[PDB]
C-alpha cells in the first residue's frame, strides 16, 4: 500500500529533481546530507606535500512516503532529472511502509501524506 | 516482529518528545537533522534587495527499532508531544525490520534493543 | 531479494569498518552523521559553573543495499570491526527493499548495485 521512496543523488541535482517532483504534485519530502562511496572516482586532496584519496563524497538523500500506484512515476521523475551519464548519479530504493501517521491530526495512510 | 519507527518532527519539539519517550521506558533511538518540504509555508529570506522563498525547512528525524506490540504506544507518545495544531508537525512511518543485531554481543531481536 | 543493511556505529570505527567492507568487495554505501541515545552513559558538560548531561552522542549511520545472500557476511564484517566490548557499539537493522534502481542506466535489482 504505502511505500518509502529513498533516492541518493548528486547535490547539484537537488533543485532540478525537487522542482520536477513538485511540478508533478509531489511536494512532500524529507531531505538530508550524506556521503556516498561507489564506483565513481574518489577525490584527490593535498596535505603537507602529500596527496590522499577521499572516498566518501557529498550526496543528497530524498525520502518520500507515496502510495504504491505513484512509485513508478516518482522513480521516472527522479531518474530523468538526476541522471548525468557519469558514474555517481545515485540509487533509488523502494521500501515498504506499514503505517503512516500525520502527527497534527492523527490521520493515517493516504490521508496522512 | 521488529519494526522501525521513524518520526519527522519540528526541531523545537525534540526535547519534549524524547523526555516523554524515555519516561515511558523507550530510551534507545537515533536522531538526525534533516530538512522537510510539505503544505507548511516556506520561509521568506532577503538577499541584495530581493526576497526569495526557502522551501526546505529544518526538521528532526527520530529512528527507533521497537517490538511490534509497542508501536502504537510509541506513536501515541510522539503524537501527543509533537503536535502543535499548525501545519508542519510531521509524519511517523512504521517500517518492517527483518533482523536487529547488537554489535557488542551479537544478540538479535528483542535481546538486541 | 534485496535488503537494506543499516548500521549505527561509533564514529571512531568508521574507517576500520569501511576498509574491511571494501576489502571483501562491498564498496557501495551511503554514510551519515547522526546522534544516538541508549544504555551507554551520556556525556557531562559544564556551563557557567553547572554540570549538565548530554544524552545524544555522535554516531555514524552506514546504509547498504545488498542481495539477501550477502546479508549475514556484511553483518559479520560490521560486528567484528565495530565492536569494542563497551556499551554504545551500536545496532544493525536489515530492512526489505522492494526495488533498487540505478539512476544512471535505469538498471534494477542486482544490476543496480
Ligand atoms: N550498495 C549500495 N548501497 C547504498 N548506497 C549505495 C550503494 N552503492 C552506491 N551507493 C550510493 C552512494 C554512491 O555515492 C552513489 C552512486 O554510486 P556509484 O557506484 O559511485 O555510481 P552509479 O550509481 O552511477 O553506478 O550511490
Ligand atoms: N510524502 C512525504 N514523505 C516524507 N516526508 C514528508 C512527506 N510530506 C511531508 N513530509 C515531512 C516533511 C515536512 O517538513 C513534514 C511536515 O509536512 P507538512 O505537509 O508541511 O505538515 P503536516 O504534516 O502537519 O501536514 O513532514
Ligand atoms: N531502539 C533503538 N532504535 C534505534 N537505535 C538505537 C536503539 N537503541 C540504541 N540505538 C542506537 C543509538 C545508540 O547510540 C547506539 C548504541 O546503543 P547503546 O544502548 O548505548 O549500546 P549497545 O548497543 O552497545 O547496547 O545504538
Ligand atoms: Cl543526516
Ligand atoms: Cl528505511
Numbering used by the authors:
A (entry chain A), B (entry chain A), C (entry chain A): 0 to 112
Give passages from the manuscript.
PII-family proteins are key players in the regulation of nitrogen metabolism in bacteria, archaea and in the plastids of plant/algae. All PII proteins known so far show a typical homotrimeric organization. The monomeric unit, of circa 11–18 kDa, consists of two α-helices, four β-strands (organized in a double ferredoxin-like fold β1α1β2β3α2β4) and three protruding loops called B, C and T. In the trimeric state, clefts are formed at the dimeric interface through the interaction of the B-loop and the base of the T-loop of one subunit with the C-loop of the adjacent one. These clefts constitute the binding site for ADP/ATP, magnesium (Mg) and 2OG.
Unexpectedly, the structure of MtGlnK1 crystallized without ligands contains an additional electron density in the cleft surrounded by the three loops. A 2′-deoxyadenosinediphosphate (dADP) molecule was modelled with high confidence. Since no nucleotide was added during the purification, the metabolite must originate from the E. coli cytoplasm and has been retained during the whole purification. dADP is coordinated by a network of hydrogen bonds from Thr29′, Ile38, Gln39, Gly87, Asp88, Lys90, Ala64′, Arg101′ and Arg103′. This state has a similar nucleotide coordination and T-loop positions compared to the E. coli AmtB-GlnK structure. We suggest that the presence of a dADP rather than ADP is artefactual and we consider that dADP would not influence the T-loop coordination differently compared to ADP. The carboxy group has an equivalent position as the Gln39 side chain in the MtGlnK1-dADP structure. Our studies also highlighted that MtGlnK1 is able to bind a deoxynucleotide without provoking further structural changes. The dADP might come from an artefact during the boiling procedure and its physiological relevance should be investigated in the future. However, our model supports that in the dADP-bound state, the T-loop could in theory block the NH3-channel after slight repositioning as shown in E. coli structures.
